[PDB]
Design an enzyme around this catalytic site. Structure first.
Site, PDB file in Angstrom:
ATOM      1  N   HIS A 183       0.827  -1.240   0.000  1.00  0.00           N
ATOM      2  CA  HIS A 183       0.000   0.000   0.000  1.00  0.00           C
ATOM      3  C   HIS A 183       0.857   1.283   0.000  1.00  0.00           C
ATOM      4  CE1 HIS A 183       0.120  -0.562   4.519  1.00  0.00           C
ATOM      5  NE2 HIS A 183       0.274   0.779   4.450  1.00  0.00           N
ATOM      6  N   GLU A 218       0.747  -8.418   0.718  1.00  0.00           N
ATOM      7  CA  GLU A 218       0.981  -7.038   1.244  1.00  0.00           C
ATOM      8  C   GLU A 218       2.479  -6.750   1.428  1.00  0.00           C
ATOM      9  OE1 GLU A 218      -1.357  -4.988   0.960  1.00  0.00           O
ATOM     10  OE2 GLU A 218      -0.452  -3.186   1.907  1.00  0.00           O
ATOM     11  N   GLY A 260       1.350   5.533  11.265  1.00  0.00           N
ATOM     12  CA  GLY A 260       2.800   5.823  11.282  1.00  0.00           C
ATOM     13  C   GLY A 260       3.664   4.616  11.635  1.00  0.00           C
ATOM     14  N   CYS A 262       3.403   1.548   9.776  1.00  0.00           N
ATOM     15  CA  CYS A 262       3.509   0.687   8.557  1.00  0.00           C
ATOM     16  C   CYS A 262       4.967   0.550   8.080  1.00  0.00           C
ATOM     17  CB  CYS A 262       2.650   1.201   7.412  1.00  0.00           C
ATOM     18  SG  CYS A 262       0.881   1.118   7.805  1.00  0.00           S
TER      19      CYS A 262
END
Length: 182
Positions: free
Chosen positions: A41, A72, A146, A148
């Protein structure tokens, strides 16, 4: 404070960079040579900032499992003039549960941040922001915005990268040794 934080600090000090995309700043784990990982992402393009240096992206691969389900993890190869310390021997070979994990983050917003998240469940399937996702690790810490890309470690093992949360729990994408064979 103790041996968990010691191992976490050893990884952060030599194997992380600050990655900036048009989607924001991420903790980015360098694995070997010029190869690093970031949550998919982050939307990595042709150019990325690495510690505020404009960097050409040589390759970027959004991983999916053999069921064609999102993992992911994006594996990025950076046009960088310096190799990472090879940490592939710290990667688990199999999906597993863990005790006593640390989530470590290093951004402009959260420099030198270490979170003892405790027990890690092999959670498996998660609907992550509407996207079916496999190989999810779960820990009962209220992670925010904050975290990730944050690195999940135990003593001796780098087990995942932080990809999301629901306000009570945090979720990491597994890292497996097989992702980084060459």
């Amino acid at each position: 404070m103790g041996p968990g934080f010691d191992f976490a600090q050893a990884i952060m000090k030599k194997n992380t960079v600050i990655a900036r995309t048009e989607k924001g700043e991420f903790t980015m784990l360098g694995v070997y040579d010029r190869v690093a990982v970031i949550p998919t992402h982050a939307s990595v393009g042709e150019i990325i900032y690495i510690n505020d240096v404009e960097t050409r992206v040589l390759d970027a691969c959004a991983l999916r499992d053999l069921t064609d389900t999102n993992l992911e993890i994006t594996i990025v190869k950076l046009d960088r003039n310096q190799k990472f310390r090879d940490i592939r021997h710290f990667l688990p070979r199999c999906e597993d549960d863990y005790n006593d994990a640390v989530l470590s983050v290093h951004t402009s917003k959260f420099p030198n941040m270490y979170i003892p998240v405790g027990q890690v469940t092999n959670y498996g399937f998660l609907n992550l922001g509407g996207t079916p996702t496999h190989r999810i690790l779960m820990y009962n810490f209220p992670t925010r915005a904050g975290q990730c890309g944050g690195v999940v470690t135990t003593t001796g093992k780098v087990i995942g990268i932080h990809v999301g949360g629901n306000g009570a729990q945090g979720f990491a994408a597994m890292l497996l040794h097989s992702y980084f064979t060459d």
